Design a protein around this ligand. Structure first.
Ligand SMILES: [Mg+2]
Ligand SMILES: [Mg+2]
Ligand SMILES: [Mg+2]
Ligand SMILES: [Mg+2]
Ligand SMILES: [Mg+2]
Ligand SMILES: [Mg+2]
Ligand SMILES: [Mg+2]
Ligand SMILES: [Mg+2]
Ligand SMILES: [Mg+2]
Lengths: 184, 141, 71, 179, 98, 50
RNA sequence: UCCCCCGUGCCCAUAGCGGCGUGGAACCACCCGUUCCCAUUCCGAACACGGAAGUGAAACGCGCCAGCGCCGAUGGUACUGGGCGGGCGACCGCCUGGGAGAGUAGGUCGGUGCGGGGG
RNA sequence: UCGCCUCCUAAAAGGUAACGGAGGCGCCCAAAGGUCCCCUCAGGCGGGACGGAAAUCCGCCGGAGAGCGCAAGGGUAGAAG
RNA sequence: GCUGACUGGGGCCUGUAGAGCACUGAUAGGGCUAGGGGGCCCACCAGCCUACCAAACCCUGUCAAACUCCGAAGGGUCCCA
């Protein structure tokens, strides 16, 4: 995932976007520079990049450094990006969100219910070099009652976690049919 | 309906409606959600009318997540009475929603269904709405 | 310390219907006693006051045990 | 001259050191306090006090007790901001042995009853806390002065920690147990 | 935290803070606002006698002796967890009236 | 105040006054107290009525 | 001057809580006693006194760690002095100064004067 | 409804209206006052004779959520308790 | 007889906007879990299950004129111009 960046001296952020670009920032232990990216181009990347995969930025210095979004601030109304925080990866252990790929048809669905995916991620610390893609999850078997979570996942090589780990990550809740009105 | 079970004060001033949303602008729970495009007091009967519409569309299926909550006291003076003699009585409760708030949102239902489901509930509301689905809502790392 | 009120504090005798016991140091001379007459710790006790008077001697191990019921 | 005294210094003290023990002549399980609260039988004080529990029970352990008083509001218990309802007595060192020892193995007995002391009853720091059905019945009886069946609840705080270190101290000191 | 620290009730300058150790009995005549300890005097940590309520009765006049050389004739007493008793240490001079 | 009743304090060595309030019922009846006079100053005072 | 400890203040969590070190030579504490001054709503527990066999266990002092606590950018918003506009209205936008709160990167298991005893 | 007190409305000094929103006062205490000396809470979890889910106990953990005669607010354990 | 409005620079006094749940309350779902329908029940010694009710507590989402861990812009005042 390749996304290009550019430097910002210190001129009206309102202009950058009133143009067509998306102001932002880069940082970690050392280094922290005000940068920016083309809005319509950064979106096409993020749509898949998200914060689960590493976004390789660039610059004039032709230095393709690896990073990942730390947080994207929205416009509330208009609901679109307004600024991004790029975290430059190193060699040091870092905490990130690895996507949980819940695979399988839970017995609770065919029976009665919906698979509410309480947590579609899980912050875990790891090595930039060794970044997982998706922590699969065994969903079949989950019935209507409570459901597996946190301390129940296959944690890949050198990838522990920064969870409770009691934090429920999923649960099958009965479906809503007919019959309503309780306040008679 | 839907309303607070307890309170420290039965009646409260009207307050204003300027500003964005303060919070609750990203999906957070389900797969699709209905977002508010204008400021407005959404009443308990409106919320209910929408939710039932939902559960009614996709009969026996998915989970609906009502995210706004009517906890603000709406007041009204007795029919044909003059100004004065104190504040009116509580007619109902409302939810102060500002532009951007994701009011409702569904889960566990086909995309096509999510749409027509959220569309209908929109009609029940007194403001313009927009349907959406998980995206840059992953506010994390 | 505390002057007044306090008891008297004086040694006497801890009798005992089964040999001497604790050494005076309380405030009582006579007493039923009975340290334990059978401790109780685990066993050596549980003298379960139920002993059916003169057990055995009658109705005992007779009437013909199990027998050749196997046939 | 003291009764148990030896029992602890002579016995128990060593069996522990090597069963546990080691190094310090201090990190060895030993008692330090012995308090005991009555509460006032199955009916508290009343303006017409009681204080017999005081005067009597006081010297059934050798030394008058103090007087505690409630707090907070009662409503359905009959009390108020308190006054009195207490009458308890702590005490350590000498009297601790003398009271429980010259009463541990000779007094506690007699009271018509079952097995040993309730096992699962300790916690941390080993303190235990039994609690006879009050029943002022024996030892030091010398009848008369009989108004209520008021008795008490004994609290024994020891050094030690865990439950073994503590239990080991009592068990090997003279505390029949578990059922 | 037996807290105490009644010394907070100190306004008037020059407090003679004390110390009741098992072996010795220290003492400093400190002037706050400047955060400086003017005079002083220690127990046998200064050599003297051997008896508690004794070494004190003198470990005092000693400190009082030095203090006068500096004109410091008026101060206030102290000893945080004091209890003004036993090792009380009465002493001439030191126009403290105490 | 109906039950409190406000009384004064006489010099007993003669006349004088100061005046305060009592509380007949609540632990009370007859007030003796040390008060500094004006007509010499330094004595004991009792109740009265006025 | 330089390390250690004993009292004292200032700064008032990056100054603590909790784990894990360790320290007694000295000081300190725990202890040994409680006849004596003095004590407890009852207990020499606490105050208090006279000591000196044993100890660092406790408490305390001094280190180690980031997990809780705490501290916390840079950017970008919000909001807003002042100025100028739009919408029937609920409200909203541009200019110019000021500019959070949260969040993120990250920071921290203190700093420091005066007087004592000791190498 | 009419005087007094607390909070809000009141737009971060003070002040600020309406038949605006929500509660109190018309006492009391000789100890609930002065000073000196000690003491520290509520709850949470254990363990507890009668013991509710708070009587009083014992052990940790607990900076204040307890307490402070009565409304509400401010304040407060380095005490006003 | 230069002290005025207004203004520049200092020093603080403050809790609105905003925001945020640490307090007081309000909150949807989920987890865990005292109870209570009740359920297999070996029957008192516990017990096991529960797309019902459901504490306290934690997680995710929020709400407040009489909430505030936090907090502007400004405003007030004094000094020098
Ligand atoms: Mg004001
Ligand atoms: Mg103002
Ligand atoms: Mg007094
Ligand atoms: Mg001028
Ligand atoms: Mg002027
Ligand atoms: Mg100015
Ligand atoms: Mg506010
Ligand atoms: Mg607001
Ligand atoms: Mg100014």
């Amino acid at each position: 995932y390749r996304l290009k960046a550019y430097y910002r001296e210190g001129e009206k952020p309102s202009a950058l976007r009133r143009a067509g670009k998306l102001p932002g920032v880069m940082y970690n232990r050392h280094l922290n520079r005000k940068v920016y990216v083309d809005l319509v181009e950064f979106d096409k990347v993020f749509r898949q990049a998200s914060i689960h995969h590493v976004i390789v930025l660039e610059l004039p210095d032709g230095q393709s450094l690896p990073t990942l979004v730390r947080q994207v601030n929205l416009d509330k109304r208009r609901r679109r990006p307004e600024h991004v925080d790029f975290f430059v990866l190193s060699d040091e252990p870092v905490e990130m969100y690895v996507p949980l790929r819940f695979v399988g048809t839970p017995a609770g669905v065919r029976a009665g219910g919906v698979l509410q995916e309480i947590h579609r991620d899980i912050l875990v610390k790891v090595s930039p070099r060794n970044i997982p893609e998706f922590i699969e999850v065994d969903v079949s078997g989950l019935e209507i009652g409570d459901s597996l979570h946190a301390s129940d996942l296959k944690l890949p090589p050198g990838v522990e976690l920064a969870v409770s780990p009691e934090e429920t990550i999923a649960a099958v809740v009965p479906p809503e049919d007919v019959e309503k009105l309780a306040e008679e | 309906m839907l309303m607070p079970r307890r309170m420290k004060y039965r009646k409260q001033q009207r307050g204003r409606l300027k500003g964005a949303t303060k919070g609750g602008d990203y999906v957070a729970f389900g797969d699709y959600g209905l977002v508010a495009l204008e400021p407005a007091w959404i009443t308990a009967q409106q919320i209910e009318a929408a939710r039932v519409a939902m559960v009614r569309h996709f009969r026996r299926g998915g989970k609906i997540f009502i995210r706004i909550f009517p906890d603000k006291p709406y007041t009204k003076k007795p029919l044909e009475v003059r100004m004065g003699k104190g504040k009116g009585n509580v007619e109902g409760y409302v939810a102060v929603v500002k532009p951007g708030r994701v009011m409702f949102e569904v889960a566990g239902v086909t995309e096509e269904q999510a749409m027509e489901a959220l569309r209908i509930a929109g009609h029940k509301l007194p403001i313009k709405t927009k349907i959406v689905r998980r995206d840059a809502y992953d506010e994390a790392q | 310390m505390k002057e007044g009120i306090h008891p008297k504090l004086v040694p006497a005798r801890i009798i005992c219907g089964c040999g001497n016991v604790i050494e005076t140091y309380s405030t009582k001379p006579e007493i039923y006693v009975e340290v334990c007459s059978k401790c109780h710790p685990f066993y050596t006790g549980q003298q379960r006051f139920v002993d059916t008077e003169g057990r055995v001697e009658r109705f005992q191990r007779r009437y013909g045990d199990s027998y050749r019921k196997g046939r | 001259d003291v009764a148990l005294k030896r029992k602890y210094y002579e016995e128990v003290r060593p069996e522990l050191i090597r069963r546990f023990g080691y190094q310090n002549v201090w990190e060895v399980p030993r008692l330090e306090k012995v308090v005991i609260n009555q509460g006032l039988g199955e009916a508290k004080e009343d303006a017409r006090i009681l204080e017999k529990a005081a005067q009597e029970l006081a010297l059934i352990t050798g030394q008058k007790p103090a007087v505690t008083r409630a707090k907070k509001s009662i409503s359905n218990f009959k009390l108020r901001k308190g006054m009195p309802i207490g009458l308890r007595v702590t005490l350590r060192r000498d009297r601790m042995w003398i009271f429980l020892e010259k009463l541990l193995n000779v007094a506690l007995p007699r009271i018509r009853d079952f097995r040993g002391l309730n096992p699962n009853s300790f916690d941390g720091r080993g303190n235990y806390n039994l609690g006879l059905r009050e029943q002022l019945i024996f030892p030091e009886i010398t009848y008369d002065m009989v108004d209520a069946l008021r008795g008490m609840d004994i609290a024994v705080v020891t050094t030690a920690e865990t439950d073994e270190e503590a239990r080991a101290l009592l068990e090997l000191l003279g505390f029949p147990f578990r059922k | 935290k037996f807290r105490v620290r009644n010394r907070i009730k100190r306004t008037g300058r020059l407090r003679l803070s004390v110390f009741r150790s098992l072996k010795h009995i220290y003492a400093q005549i400190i002037d706050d606002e400047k955060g400086v300890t003017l005079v002083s005097a220690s127990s046998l940590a200064l050599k003297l006698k051997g008896n508690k309520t004794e070494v004190a009765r003198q470990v005092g006049r000693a400190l009082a002796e030095k203090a006068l050389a500096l004109g410091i004739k008026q101060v206030a007493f102290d000893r945080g967890p004091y209890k003004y008793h036993g090792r009380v240490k009465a002493l001439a001079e030191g126009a403290r009236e105490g | 105040v109906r039950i409190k009743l406000l009384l004064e304090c006489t010099e007993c060595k003669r006349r004088n006054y100061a005046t305060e309030k009592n509380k007949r019922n609540t632990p009370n009846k007859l007030e003796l107290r040390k008060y500094c006079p004006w007509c010499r100053k330094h004595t004991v005072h009792r109740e009265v009525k006025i």
